[PDB]
Amino acid sequence: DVIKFKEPERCDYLYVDENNKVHILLPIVGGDEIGLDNTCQTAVELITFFYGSAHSGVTKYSAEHQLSEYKRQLEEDIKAINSQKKISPHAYDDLLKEKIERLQQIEKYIELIQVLKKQYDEQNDIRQLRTGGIPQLPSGVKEIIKSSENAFAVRLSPYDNDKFTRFDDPLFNVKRNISKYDTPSRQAPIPIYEGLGYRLRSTLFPEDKTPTPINKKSLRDKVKSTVLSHYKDEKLNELITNLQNELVKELVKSDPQYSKLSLSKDPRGKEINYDYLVNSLMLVDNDSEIGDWIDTILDATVDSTVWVAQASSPFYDGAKEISSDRDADKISIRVQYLLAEANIYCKTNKLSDANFGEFFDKEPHATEIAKRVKEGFTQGADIEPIIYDYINSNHAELGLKSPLTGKQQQEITDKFTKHYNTIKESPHFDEFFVADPDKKGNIFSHQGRISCHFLDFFTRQTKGKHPLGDLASHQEALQEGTSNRLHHKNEVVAQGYEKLDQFKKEVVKLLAENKPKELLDYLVATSPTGVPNYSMLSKETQNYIAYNRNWPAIQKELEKATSIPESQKQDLSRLLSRHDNLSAITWS
Ligand SMILES: [Ba+2]
Ligand SMILES: [Ba+2]
Ligand SMILES: [Ba+2]
C-alpha cells in the first residue's frame, strides 16, 4: 500500500549522463586534481575496486558488490512498478523504461568485471592486487597513464627516498639517491653528490652546518628597508616622495585603486611639515632617527587596513632560518615540486614537451638555482619568481617558444600553492600524480577519485578479444562531455522522480483553479514517447481527483470526450470513480 523507490541518485564508481548511458569509472588514485595516494599505497583504490578493503576505520566494498546492490535496487523498483500495471497498464512507463535501460547496462558491466577477472587474467595482472606484497598498477592502467594528455606523474628527490614508486612514466623527473630499502640494514640512503636535490639540500644547509637566514619581511618592513637602504627641510620632502613612491608601487600590485594614495597630507588636509610632526603631534624631535620619521609619516597618513598581508607562500612557513638537514630537505622538495608544477603547466598548455628535471639536474643550473634560492630566502624575497626568471632566462633550452607571461606564472603559483597545501602532510614526497579535469584527456574526476573509464582499461586489458556489444560507444560518449569533472550524483535519475512530483503539483494546481476540461486534457496528454500523463497517478493524486469538488464535472467531461481511446477512458473511469486502488509512492 506504499512504494518506496530504492534506486539511489548516487553509487560508487557510477556516473549516469544526461542520455541515460551508464559509465563506470575505474579509480587510479584518490583526489580531485592531485593524487593523495603515493608509493606503497598507490594501489589501494584499485585493490578496493576489485576486492574491497577495510582501512583507516572505514569499510569499502568492491565495485561488483556495489553494482549488484544497485541492480537489486533497480529490480525492486521495476517489480514495484509492474505490480501497479495490474491496476493501470500504463503506470510509470517512462520511469520504467529508463530504469530498465540502466539495469541492462549495469548487468553488462558486472559481466565485464566478472569475465575480466575470470577469463582474461592469465598473467595475474589483477590478482596481484590481492596477493602481491606491494602491488603494481595493472598494465592497462599504465598504458592509459602513459598515453594520457591531461594527467601526468612527477618524481622528485627527497633525501630519504622510497624505491617503491609506482608511476613509471613521469613527466618531470630528477636523479635520486639509492633508497634505504635497497640496502641490507634498510635505515639510510646512499647519497649521490650531483643533481638538483643534492645542490638544493647542500646549499640551503651545508656540511659545515652554517644556518641560512630566512628574513621574511612584511609589505611595511619591505618598504621601510628598501627606503632606508638610501640612508646611513627638503630632506623631508625627498623622504616622503620616495616613501610614497615605494609604498604605492608595492600596493598597486594587489589593487590598482591604491594609485591615488598620497602621504603628502593627513586625512584632514593638514600638511605634513616639521611644526606639525614635532609640535602638534609630538612623535618626533630634532635628534630622532629616520626610521621613526618614516613610521610617524605612515602613522599620520594611512589607516591600519592597508597593512593586511597577502596570502602566504608555501616557501615561508614562519621559521627564522634553515637550521637542519631536514629543513633543507623540506625546502628542496618544495622548490622541486614548484618546478614540477611549472613543467606540468607547460605540458598541459602545449607550451613544451620537455622534462625540466633533466635540465635542472645538469650543471651549472643545479648549483645556480640553489644559490639564487638561498640568496632569495636571505633577502626576504618571493621564491617563485626566482624560479620563473631562471626558466625564462632559459626558455629556449626548455622547449618553450617564448617566456612565461606574468599571468601564466601567477597561474602556476596558484596551482602549486593549492596542490602543495593539499599534500604537505604526505608521508612520502617521492612522486605525485597530477590531473587536470578541465582539459581534454582520458582521466576524470569523480567522487574524490582520479579515474579513467572502465571500458578504456577493459578494452586495453582484454586486447579487444571480448566484444562490448551495447557498451561499444560509451567511452567515446563520455569524451563528448564539456568537462572531465563528473558530478558526484546522477541528475538523470533524480529527474525521474522530480517528474512525478511535477505531475502532483500540476494536478493540485488544475484542481484548485476549478478547471475540469484542462485537467482531463492534462491527464490524457502524452509525453514525447507517447505515454499518457495519467500513467503517473498514485494514491495521493488519485484521491485528490476522485474526492474533489470538481469530480462530477470531470466525469461529465470524460463521458462527453470522443478523442480519447476507450481503453484510456476505461482506465480513468475505473481509477477515479467510487477495488482498483493505486499504491502511494515515495523515494529517497
Ligand atoms: Ba610637502
Ligand atoms: Ba571533452
Ligand atoms: Ba476506487
Ligand nearest to the CA of 439: 2
Do the Cβ atoms of 224 and 341 come closer than 8 Å? no
Cell of 469: 556489444
- Looking at 309, 342, 357, the residue that finishes a domain is 309
Ligand 2: centre distance to CA 343 (Å): 23
For strands 212-213 and 53-55, give the pairing. Answer: unpaired
Q: Which helix (H) or strand (E) holds 200?
A: helix 196-204
The backbone torsions φ and ψ at residue 485, rounded to the nearest 5 degrees and listed phi first, read -90, 105
Is residue 204 within 8 A of residue 322, CB to CB? The reply is yes
Ligand nearest the Cα atom of residue 270? 1
**Strand boundaries in 330-419, DSSP class E:** none
Task: Please count the CA atoms within 13 angstroms of the CA of 459 that sit on its side-chain side.
Answer: 14
Contacts of 527 (CB under 8 A, 6+ apart): 94, 533
Statement to judge: residues 397 and 476 lie in one domain? no
Q: How far is the CA of 264 from the centre of ligand 1 (A)?
A: 5
Nearest to 142 by CA among 112, 158, 113, 165: 165
Q: How many CA atoms lie within 13 A of 204 on its CB side?
A: 29
272 CA to centre of ligand 1 in angstroms: 6
Residue holding cell 492534462? 522
Residue type, 125: D
Compute the distance from residue 416 Cα to the ligand 2 centre, in Å: 24
* Nearest-angstrom CA–CA distance, 184 and 533: 76
Q: Taking the CA atoms of the chain, what radius of gyration do you get in angstroms? A: 34
| List of long-range contacts for 126-130, beta carbons under 8 Å, 24+ apart | 126/50, 126/461, 129/43, 129/46, 129/47, 129/50, 129/51, 130/47, 130/50, 130/51
Which of 186, 168, 157, 174 is CA-nearest to residue 42? 168
Clarify whether residues 336 and 443 are in a common domain.
Answer: no
Tell how far the Cα of 266 is from the centroid of ligand 1, in angstroms.
11
d(CA 510, CA 210): 84
**Both 419 and 344 in a single domain?**
yes
Cα–ligand 2 centroid distance for 360 (angstroms):
34
Running DSSP on this structure, what letter comes out for residue 31?
B
CA distance 434 to 310: 27
The H-or-E segment that residue 113 falls in is: helix 93-119
Task: Name the domain count of the chain.
Answer: 5
- CA 536 to centroid of ligand 3, rounded, Å: 16
Proximal ligand: closest to the CA of 577: 3
For residue 546, the ligand closest to its alpha carbon is 3
CB 540 within 8 A of CB 582: no
| Euclidean distance between CA atoms 238 and 226, whole angstroms | 14
User: What are the cell numbers at 59?
Assistant: 569499510
Q: How far is the CA of 520 from the centre of ligand 2 (A)?
A: 45
Contact 411, 363 (CB under 8 A): no
CA 179, 183, 188, 190 dihedral sign is: negative
- 72: domain range? 1-10+61-120+579-588
First to last CA, the chain: 17
Residues 42 and 134 in one domain: yes
Same domain membership, residue 399 and residue 339: yes
Same domain, 260 and 248: yes
Among 254, 279, 309, where does a domain finish? 309
The cell for 185 is 640494514
Cβ atoms of 77 and 6 closer than 8 Å = yes
What 3-state class would DSSP assign to 485?
strand
Ligand nearest to the CA of 581: 3
3-class secondary structure, 411: helix
Q: Is the dihedral of CA 416, 178, 162, 355 positive or negative?
A: positive
What SS3 class is residue 7?
coil
DSSP-derived pairing of the beta strands 449-453 and 22-30: antiparallel
Number of CB atoms found within 10 A of residue 72's CB:
12
For 528-548, give one letter per residue: b (16+ CB within 10 A) or e: eeebbbbbbbbebbbebbeeb
Distance from the CA of 435 to the center of ligand 2, in angstroms? 14
All three cell numbers of 50: 576489485
- 417: which residues sit within 8 A by CB, 6+ positions away? 311, 313, 314
Strand segments, DSSP code E, in 386-455 are: 431-435, 443-445, 449-453
Q: Using CA atoms, how far apart are residues 318 and 325, in angstroms rounded to an integer?
A: 17
For residue 432, the CA-to-ligand 1 centroid distance in Å is 57
Q: How far is the CA of 476 from the centre of ligand 2 (A)?
A: 9
Measured in Å, residue 551 CA sits from the centre of ligand 3 at 13
Q: Is the dihedral of CA 478, 483, 484, 490 positive or negative?
A: negative
Local structure of residue 536 (DSSP, 8 states): G
Pick the closest to residue 16 from 91, 99, 94 (CA basis).
99
Distance from C-alpha of 308 to C-alpha of 219, rounded to nearest angstrom: 9
Backbone angles phi, psi at 29, to 5 degrees: -145, 165
Return the C-alpha cell found at 84: 501497479
Q: Which ligand is nearest to the CA of 547?
A: 3
Could you give the count of Cα atoms lying within 13 Å of 210 in the half-sphere of its Cβ?
Answer: 3
351-360 burial, b for 16+ CB within 10 Å, e for fewer?
bbebbbbebb
Question: What DSSP letter does each residue of 489-510 carry, written as one string?
Answer: S-HHHHHHHHHHHHHHHHHHHH
- HEC profile of 374-397: HHHHHHCCCCHHHHHHHHHHCCCC
Is 170 found in the same domain as 224?
no
The CA-based dihedral angle spanning residues 192, 193, 195, 201, taken in that order and rounded to the nearest 10 degrees: 100
Q: Are residues 171 and 211 in the same domain?
A: no
Please report which helix (H) or strand (E) contains residue 60, including its range: strand 58-60
Do 324 and 337 meet the contact criterion of CB atoms below 8 Å apart? Answer: no
How many Å lie between the centroid of ligand 3 and the Cα of residue 582?
A: 9
Ligand nearest to the CA of 543: 3
Question: How far does residue 241's CA lie from ligand 1's centre (Å)?
Answer: 9
DSSP letters, 86-103, are: TT-TTTTHHHHHHHHHHH
* C-beta atoms surrounding 270 within 10 Å: 12
The answer on 514 and 463 residing in a single domain is: no
Shortest-distance ligand to the CA of residue 149: 2
Ligand nearest to the CA of 235: 1
Question: Is the separation of the CB atoms in 87 and 581 below 8 Å?
Answer: yes
Task: Please indicate, yes or no, whether residues 50 and 170 belong to a single structural domain of this protein.
Answer: yes
Distance CA(71)–CA(82), nearest Å, equals: 16
Question: Where a domain ends, among 465, 486, 507?
Answer: 486
CA distance 134 to 130: 10
Q: CA torsion sign, 252 to 257 to 262 to 267?
A: negative
CA separation for the pair 434, 28 (Å, rounded): 11
Kindly give the distance from the C-alpha atom of residue 451 to the centroid of ligand 2, in angstroms, as a whole number: 15
By C-alpha distance, which of 150, 170, 166, 155 is closest to 337?
155
- Collapsing DSSP to helix, strand or coil, 57 comes out as coil
- C-alpha 271 to ligand 1 mean position (Å): 7
Can you tell me which residue has the cell 614508486? 165
CB 444 within 8 A of CB 437: yes
Measured in angstroms, how far is the CA atom of residue 540 from the centroid of ligand 3? 12
CA of 479 to the centre of ligand 2 (A): 5
Sequence-separated contacts (24+) of 506-512 with Cβ below 8 Å: 507/541, 507/544, 507/545, 508/544, 511/544, 511/545, 511/548, 511/550
Q: How far is the CA of 475 from the centre of ligand 2 (A)?
A: 11
Backbone angles phi, psi at 91, to 5 degrees: -40, 115
In this structure, the answer to whether residues 504 and 539 fall within a common structural domain is yes
472 CA to middle of ligand 2, Å?
18
Judged by its nearest atom, the ligand closest to the C-alpha of residue 264 is 1
CA dihedral 220, 223, 226, 228 (to 10 degrees): -70
Residues 497 and 451 in one domain: no
